[PDB]
């Protein structure tokens, strides 16, 4: 036979983290 | 016989920390 | 024949850090 | 199976600095933000910092920004924390624990005593 | 921060009673859709091991024991039945804002 195939293309990049909530009062 | 076809594409990484909080209004 | 696909691709990088949060009223 | 393997036991005096370590193993090392905690028998967890491995960004929790220094080396798929200008109340056992919406795997613990 | 206060301090409970502890959040910890604080076991000499997330959820290897209920800034952790596996310190902690918090602990001592 063959020998096997490359390496497939790296991931997509995770997603980003959320915000932080609500600043105090103005 | 010709190599193997490449390999599926790579899993999603892990979601970033969460940021902190906002600003005093 | 062709030989096996080659193993998946490296996963994708930690996401971005989050942002500071929205201002209050 | 995904594995933390932390650096050993330590002991400084004060105002000395220290260096730490966490090889990690069994999955992807870029692919997780890794964090830091500390705990200090009887008392809870704190959280001291995180850094994305891939780039090497940082954040640090305000309390630790000029205790607490991290680092990460993609070669070795270790992260790497150093404290300095020890002080007893720095004396206490570190955690690096990894990090996927929540802290689903921790290493052991490298332990810090701090004394004349 | 966001400050998380658990309660009781201690408790104990005889071996196929029920046993719970309740996290309460100084600001509610929820985005969107869905609850962010997860509880965690801790035994002597050892790291935090992840017991739920989402405070619904129940992590893979987890046994059925262990439920726990909560929503917006108030949750609890529930086991049924207690165990001798299950002496231990029980934190809760939240991933919704940083710097991340974890509670400040609660004993479980079995009950004879």
């Known amino acids: 036979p063959g020998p096997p195939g490359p390496p497939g293309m790296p991931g997509e990049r995770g997603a980003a983290g959320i915000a932080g909530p609500k600043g105090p009062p103005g | 016989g010709p190599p193997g076809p490449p390999g599926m594409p790579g899993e999603r990484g892990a979601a970033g920390i969460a940021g902190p909080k906002g600003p005093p209004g | 024949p062709p030989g096996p696909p080659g193993m998946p691709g490296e996963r994708g990088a930690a996401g971005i850090a989050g942002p500071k949060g929205p201002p209050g009223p | 199976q995904v594995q933390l393997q932390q650096s050993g036991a330590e002991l400084a005096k004060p105002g000395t600095s220290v260096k730490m370590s966490c090889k990690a193993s069994?999955?992807?090392?870029?692919?997780?933000?890794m964090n830091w905690v500390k705990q200090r028998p009887g008392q809870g967890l704190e959280w001291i910092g995180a850094?994305?491995?891939?780039?090497?960004?940082?954040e640090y929790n305000q309390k630790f920004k000029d205790k607490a220094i991290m680092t990460a080396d993609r070669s070795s798929s270790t992260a790497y924390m150093q404290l300095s200008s020890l002080t007893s109340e720095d004396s206490a056992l570190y955690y690096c624990?990894?990090?996927?919406?929540?802290?689903?795997?921790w290493g052991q613990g490298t332990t810090l005593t701090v004394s004349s | 921060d966001i400050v998380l206060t658990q309660s009781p301090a201690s408790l104990a409970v005889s071996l196929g009673q029920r046993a719970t502890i309740s996290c309460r959040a100084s600001?509610?910890?929820?985005?969107?859709?869905?609850?962010?604080m997860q509880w965690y076991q801790q035994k002597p000499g050892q790291p935090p091991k992840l017991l739920i997330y989402?405070?619904?959820n129940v992590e893979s290897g987890v046994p059925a024991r262990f439920s726990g209920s909560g929503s917006g800034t108030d949750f609890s952790l529930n086991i049924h039945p207690v165990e001798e596996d299950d002496i231990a310190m029980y934190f809760c902690?939240?991933?919704?804002?940083?710097?991340?918090?974890f509670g400040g602990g609660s004993k479980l001592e079995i009950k004879r």
């Open positions: 624990a990894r990090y996927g919406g929540y802290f689903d795997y």
């Open positions: 069994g999955y992807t090392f870029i692919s997780y933000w």
């Open positions: 850094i994305n491995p891939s780039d090497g960004y940082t």
């Open positions: 600001e509610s910890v929820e985005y969107f859709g869905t609850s962010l």
């Open positions: 989402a405070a619904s």
């Open positions: 902690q939240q991933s919704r804002e940083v710097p991340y918090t």
